[PDB]
Design an enzyme around this catalytic site. Structure first.
Site, short mmCIF file in Angstrom:
data_model
loop_
_atom_site.label_atom_id
_atom_site.label_comp_id
_atom_site.label_asym_id
_atom_site.label_seq_id
_atom_site.Cartn_x
_atom_site.Cartn_y
_atom_site.Cartn_z
N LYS A 48 1.18 5.39 -4.85
CA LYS A 48 -0.01 5.39 -5.87
C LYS A 48 -1.05 6.26 -4.93
CE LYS A 48 0.71 3.93 -9.88
NZ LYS A 48 0.47 4.52 -11.23
N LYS A 49 -1.04 5.96 -3.53
CA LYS A 49 -2.36 6.48 -2.44
C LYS A 49 -1.81 7.87 -2.17
CE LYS A 49 -3.77 1.85 -0.78
NZ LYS A 49 -3.04 1.31 -1.80
N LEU A 50 -0.85 8.49 -2.78
CA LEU A 50 -0.79 9.92 -2.48
C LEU A 50 -1.38 10.94 -3.50
CD1 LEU A 50 3.10 10.40 -1.75
CD2 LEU A 50 1.34 10.66 -0.01
#
Ligand SMILES: CCCCCCCCCCCCCCCCCC(=O)O[C@H](COC(=O)CCCCCCCCCCCCCCC)COP(=O)(O)OCC[N+](C)(C)C
Ligand SMILES: CCCCCCCCCCCCCCCCCC(=O)O[C@H](COC(=O)CCCCCCCCCCCCCCC)COP(=O)(O)OCC[N+](C)(C)C
Ligand SMILES: C/C(=C\Cc1c(C)c(O)c2ccccc2c1O)CCC[C@H](C)CCC[C@H](C)CCCC(C)C
Ligand SMILES: *[C@@H]1O[C@H](CO)[C@@H](O[C@@H]2O[C@H](CO)[C@@H](O)[C@H](O)[C@H]2NC(C)=O)[C@H](O)[C@H]1NC(C)=O
Ligand SMILES: *[C@@H]1O[C@H](CO)[C@@H](O[C@@H]2O[C@H](CO)[C@@H](O)[C@H](O)[C@H]2NC(C)=O)[C@H](O)[C@H]1NC(C)=O
Ligand SMILES: *[C@@H]1O[C@H](CO)[C@@H](O[C@@H]2O[C@H](CO)[C@@H](O)[C@H](O)[C@H]2NC(C)=O)[C@H](O)[C@H]1NC(C)=O
Ligand SMILES: *[C@@H]1O[C@H](CO)[C@@H](O)[C@H](O)[C@H]1NC(C)=O
EC number: 4.1.1.90
Lengths: 693, 35
Positions: A187-189
């Site tokens: 999700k943090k990409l």
């Protein structure tokens, strides 16, 4: 023998058929690590119930007789009266204690699980990832045989004292933690995490002080804060599983969790994750730890002998698997598949979609979007007279997450519709105008300001037609805007606005905000002064000096969105600061021996410092004295030793616990023995709130 | 809220867009203490 078997713990042939899979997932394993995790989870939830769940604040959140707007997941659910809510929280506490001590494990797990989800579904504004994780862990532990070692139930039943447990108990928990780490990493990409925008101001904390010896602040906020988090999430997903990488993984993960505990106010999430990290170790670490102790300690610690055979495992000799083994295997596979699917299920429930995806809490997107609200206007038109009025932004509400979700806005509109007739308003039409920016972009509207939300159309599985799109084409402007932010004085301030075609913004510059100017960055706008009904069309790179204390309007008249900015300074504060500096200079001149002439009478209170036996001070003198007192108080606060701070922290927590316990006791007495006279209730309530000292 | 002073605002005090400052980084993953 095979290397794959050693690394992964199972052979390929074990997955050839269903029966072999059931046997693999129900093989014997030691129960010790599961018991330790049970104890720590129970203890942490016991500490967490009176602090974050809101038992201390429950007497001012579900108060009887108060008219408030709720935000439950289902409109059918409604809060019970206050006393029954206190009873529900008491049952939660008892269940948590039972899980901690392992006494009547299944009943305690159910008593913790059902109330927790009742409270969780009752309000969507208190949803966060670390609460959903606790709920999921409580749901999982209801089925696992975690009371087989170091439990009171073991002492009360020989059959469940130091016995084997099936392997899927460990597998489900390991998969849950792995899913948390991996989904958080993926999700943090996002463009706002890899480019340094989210959590841009967290690199100034003193915990990052050593990194600044080798790196600049700009690089420290990108390599360490942002990229380090992503790499640690994915690697901590993978490293802990394999034997080679477990030590380094444990070190990095523990450092990560401690730093997260100190930096944020998440609560008990970091400690629960720290307790969960050892679960990837060998299942018998507490037993060998107990072995490596003197005999005196062994007389008090749990048993060290090998575990006995159990009935909830498949033993190879063969044994035909029964029903519970198959149910366990199916539960493991289906639950892990559901956990994988649910964070990406936002294409089905499109009603809850917004600028971000879905309701917050079940996506593992932690610290990835930050929002800054500028203004919130709520307008109402009466259906009988035609009058147009403005409501306070947050009336009849307790949380401020309704400014970012459409469904909560609909619920708030319905609540206002039912409540306004108490204040002499007929069937109203309510309009909302909310400005919000995500990760330091232009501030733009989130909902259309021309739509009656009371009569608007909303269904969970269809896209909302009155949510403005996020204008992502103006993303690169965040570079240039920052430069403009750094070209101002210590008094001037700037606000950037991006407006859609057709709409208009009506604003009322306060009399204090003299020297306010409007400048256009992109598009075509027309600025209208209603005092003389004069409108001018502004082109690119043009600046206008707005009136102070009047009404003006800005209309967008371009095929594309228009971006402009307000630059303003507060004249009244500047004049007050100049006068205060002059007064301080006079005081300093008097103090150092200069200004031998007699002081004015207005100055005499300043030297005296007390208004006794004289005329009341002017507002300037009062402001100066207040500023001096505030500065002295702040300075005294700064010069406080560590032990005093720790003592105050402990006393405050003791106060919270005592208030929770006493209020719960009063509620239970009211339920059981009836309600006494008002005087006795007042006396008891007064005694409850008293500070420990 | 009651008394017809916390549930209604006049026109000029409800349209004041610009306000001087002497949360802005909320992450939605922080428990808000109440007392
Ligand atoms: C007809 C139907 C046919 C079958 C269809 C369904 C097939 C499903 C296959 C997938 C499920 C398999 C479950 C296997 C259970 C299992 O192995 O459980 C455990 C493994 O635990 C898990 O469940 C792992 C959870 C996921 C963690 C992340 C794994 C990363 C893998 C990376 C690629 C390799 C065995 O552990 P052990 O005690 O034997 O220790 C082994 C590892 N050491 C010693 C290094 C610590
Ligand atoms: C095998 C082991 C494996 C490793 C596991 C490691 C982890 C185990 C964790 C176990 C639990 C340890 C305790 C946790 C305590 C805890 O969470 O601390 C606290 C919460 O816990 C507490 O404060 C508990 C206090 C309980 C009350 C204690 C009272 C003691 C009174 C002593 C006598 C005083 C007498 C005075 C008169 C003479 C965090 O506070 P917060 O979230 O509000 O944070 C505030 C600051 N910020 C926001 C900046 C972070
Ligand atoms: C705030 C951060 C992540 C959000 C978060 C939180 C709060 C959690 O509770 C999580 C719990 C479980 C799983 C994921 C969670 C999560 O994603 C990054 C914090 C960055 C950190 C403080 C910087 C230090 C980075 C590592 C440890 C050091 C590397 C430095 C060099 C050697 C390269
Ligand atoms: C109001 O106008 C702007 C802020 O709105 C400021 O004026 C600046 O004027 C000084 C005069 O020397 C320049 O050095 C600055 O570069 C200007 N700032 C800009 C153009 O952003 C000031 O706050 C107020 N000025 C007046 C005359 O009232
Ligand atoms: C100043 O210019 C604006 C530019 O739009 C005029 O606004 C429009 O106002 C008329 C009524 O005067 C409305 O019927 C239109 O719908 C408005 N247009 C838009 C796009 O909103 C405004 O009237 C002008 N003011 C004066 C005093 O001439
Ligand atoms: C503009 O600057 C003034 C400087 O005084 C700000 O004023 C204080 O405003 C608050 C309300 O926000 C009052 O209660 C105080 O009494 C004011 N201070 C005084 C008179 O010393 C003001 O808030 C700023 N903003 C606006 C919109 O005027
Ligand atoms: C007007 O509103 C106030 C507040 O409730 C109160 O006097 C009464 O409800 C209303 N009176 C009339 C005559 O409408």
């Amino acid at each position: 023998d095979s290397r794959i078997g050693k690394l992964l713990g199972f052979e390929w042939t074990d997955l050839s058929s269903w029966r072999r899979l059931v046997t693999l997932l129900n093989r014997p394993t030691d129960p010790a690590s599961l018991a330790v995790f049970r104890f720590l989870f129970g203890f942490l939830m016991v500490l967490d119930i009176p602090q974050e769940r809101g038992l201390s604040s429950l007497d001012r959140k579900y108060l009887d007789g108060l008219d408030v707007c709720r935000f439950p997941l289902l409109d059918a659910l409604r809060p019970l009266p206050l006393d029954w809510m206190y009873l529900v929280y008491t049952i939660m506490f008892l269940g948590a204690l039972g899980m901690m001590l392992g006494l009547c494990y299944r009943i305690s797990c159910v008593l913790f699980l059902l109330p927790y989800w009742y409270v969780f579904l009752l309000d969507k504004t208190s949803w966060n990832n670390h609460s959903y994780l606790y709920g999921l862990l409580a749901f999982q532990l209801t089925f696992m045989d975690a009371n087989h070692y170091w439990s009171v139930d073991g002492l009360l039943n020989a059959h469940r004292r130091n016995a084997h447990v099936p392997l899927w108990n460990y597998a489900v928990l390991r998969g849950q933690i792995f899913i948390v780490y991996f989904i958080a990493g993926v999700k943090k990409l996002d463009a706002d995490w890899v480019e340094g925008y989210s959590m841009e101001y967290l690199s100034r904390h003193w915990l990052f002080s050593p990194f600044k010896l080798l790196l600049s602040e700009e690089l420290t906020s990108l390599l360490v804060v942002h990229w380090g988090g992503l790499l640690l999430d994915l690697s901590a997903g993978f490293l802990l599983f394999f034997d080679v990488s477990r030590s380094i993984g444990l070190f990095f993960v523990s450092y990560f969790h401690c730093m997260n505990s100190q930096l944020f106010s998440i609560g008990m999430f970091s400690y629960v994750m720290l307790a969960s990290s050892p679960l990837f170790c060998s299942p018998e670490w507490p037993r060998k730890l107990v072995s490596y102790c003197p005999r005196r300690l062994q007389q008090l610690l749990p048993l060290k002998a090998a575990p006995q055979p159990s009935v909830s495992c498949v033993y190879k000799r063969g044994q035909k698997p029964g029903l519970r083994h198959q149910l366990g295997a199916a539960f493991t596979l289906l639950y892990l598949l559901e956990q994988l699917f649910l964070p990406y299920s936002h294409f089905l429930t499109q009603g809850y979609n917004n600028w971000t995806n879905g309701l917050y809490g079940y996506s593992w997107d932690m610290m990835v979007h930050s929002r800054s609200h500028q203004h919130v206007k709520i307008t109402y038109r009466d259906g009988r007279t035609g009058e147009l009025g403005y409501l306070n932004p947050g009336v009849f509400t307790q949380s401020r997450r309704w400014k970012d979700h459409a469904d909560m806005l609909k619920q708030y509109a319905t609540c206002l519709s039912r409540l306004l007739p108490k204040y002499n308003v007929t069937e109203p039409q309510i309009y909302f105008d909310i400005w919000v920016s995500i990760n330091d972009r232009f501030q733009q509207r989130i909902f259309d300001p021309r739509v009656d939300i009371v009569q608007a159309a909303w269904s969970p599985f269809q896209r909302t037609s009155w949510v403005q799109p996020l204008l992502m084409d103006l993303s690169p402007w965040r570079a240039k805007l920052q430069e403009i932010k750094s070209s101002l004085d210590n008094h001037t301030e700037v606000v950037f606005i991006a407006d859609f075609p057709g709409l208009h913004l009506e604003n009322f510059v306060s009399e204090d905000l003299g020297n306010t100017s409007i400048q256009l960055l992109q598009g075509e706008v027309t600025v209208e002064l209603v005092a003389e009904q004069k409108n001018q069309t502004l082109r690119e790179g043009e600046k206008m000096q707005l009136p102070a204390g009047e009404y003006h309007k800005v209309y967008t008249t371009s095929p594309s969105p228009s971006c402009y900015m307000y630059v303003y300074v507060n004249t009244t504060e500047l004049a007050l600061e100049q006068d205060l500096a002059y007064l301080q200079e006079l005081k300093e001149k008097v103090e150092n021996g200069s200004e031998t002439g007699p002081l004015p009478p207005e100055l005499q209170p300043l030297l005296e410092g007390e208004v006794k036996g004289g005329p009341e001070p002017t507002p300037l003198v009062q402001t100066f004295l207040r500023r001096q007192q505030r500065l002295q108080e702040i300075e005294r606060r700064r010069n406080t030793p560590f032990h005093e701070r720790f003592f105050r922290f402990l006393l405050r927590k003791l106060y919270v616990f005592r208030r929770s316990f006493l209020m719960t006791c009063i509620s239970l007495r009211n339920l059981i023995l009836g309600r006494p006279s008002l005087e006795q209730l007042a006396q008891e309530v007064t005694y409850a709130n008293l500070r420990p000292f | 809220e009651e008394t017809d002073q916390e549930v209604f605002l006049g026109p000029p005090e409800a349209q004041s867009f610009l306000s001087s400052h002497t949360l802005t980084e909320r992450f939605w993953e922080s428990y808000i203490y109440n007392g």
